[PDB]
Amino acid sequence: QLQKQLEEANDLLRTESDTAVRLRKSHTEMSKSISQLESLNRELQERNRILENSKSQTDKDYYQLQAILEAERRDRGHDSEMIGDLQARITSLQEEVKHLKHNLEKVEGERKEAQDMLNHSEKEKNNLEIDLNYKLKSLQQRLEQEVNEHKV
Amino acid sequence: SQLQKQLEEANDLLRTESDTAVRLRKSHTEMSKSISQLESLNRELQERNRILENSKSQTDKDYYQLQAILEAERRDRGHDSEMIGDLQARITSLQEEVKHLKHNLEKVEGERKEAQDMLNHSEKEKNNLEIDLNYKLKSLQQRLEQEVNEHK
């Protein structure tokens, strides 16, 4: 009868106030978890902020070494210009040497011919002087030998 | 009809209770959404970190490659500098060979000129001598033979 109807509402009202205790326990554990998670996510957010700046710093250091590389290259470039100009100057000097040598030779040849002509002129003139000297004296001797023939 | 009011309490409570059992079933589904979205953000945040750490690490590797390019290419500058010195030496030798040839050419051409002058003096001295004597001998000879003939 009703004794079986209240013995039911008994077991039911029990499990209800029972599972209400379990829900309250459920909810105090989820309060505790979401609070520890809010304090953890705060940490991961900060390690990330740090990572980011870290990576951005690594970038700057890379770029900075590139800038140094591109300056080196700019200098190695001036060395190649310089080497090029020394080589060109060398080439020019060499052909100048060649040319001057060839001129030396030629002028040296012309000096020789000149000296040959000079020598011949001097010898020819010398022969003349030697000849005239003896012959003129030979005239003066022949006249002397007549004068002195009758000197008493 | 007094206990009928007690069944108005119970009825009314089994509705306020059946109602907060539905506000819960909804609350819990709204929370299992948040938590699912947090899991999302969390996998995303973890992804960025991974990419960050990887991009950062590839940059470190590239940095060391870059440094190696600097060292390698800086050897080719030690050689460039040794060359510039050698070509600078080859150039001073040549500038001297030129200085010396230019000198020799000036002298050898001086010698030529002088030999040409001496030759012109020499020919002039001789031909003046020959001309003068020729004239003086003519008169002396004629007048002697004016007499050698007036003998007969």
Where does B1-152 sit in CATH, by number?
A: 1.20.5.340
- Chain A positions touching B48 (Cβ under 8 A) are 48
CB A125 within 8 A of CB B126: yes
Find the length of chain A. Answer: 152
Compute CA distances B1 → A6, A22, A121, whole Å: 20, 38, 178
Within a 10 A sphere around the Cβ of B115, how many other Cβ atoms? Answer: 20
3-state SS class at A1: coil
User: DSSP labels for A103-148?
Assistant: HHHHHHHHHHHHHHHHHHHHHHHHHHHHHHHHHHHHHHHHHHHHHH
Contact B112 A117 (CB under 8 A): no
Residue of B nearest to A73 (CA): B73
Q: One-letter amino acid identity for A8?
A: E
CB B52 within 8 A of CB A55: yes
- Which experimental method was this entry solved with? X-ray
Scanning chain B, the segments in alpha helix (DSSP H) are 3-150
Separation between Cα atoms, residue A92 and residue A95, nearest integer Å: 5
The distance from CA B39 to its chain's CA centroid, rounded to whole angstroms, is 56
Q: One-letter amino acid identity for A92?
A: S
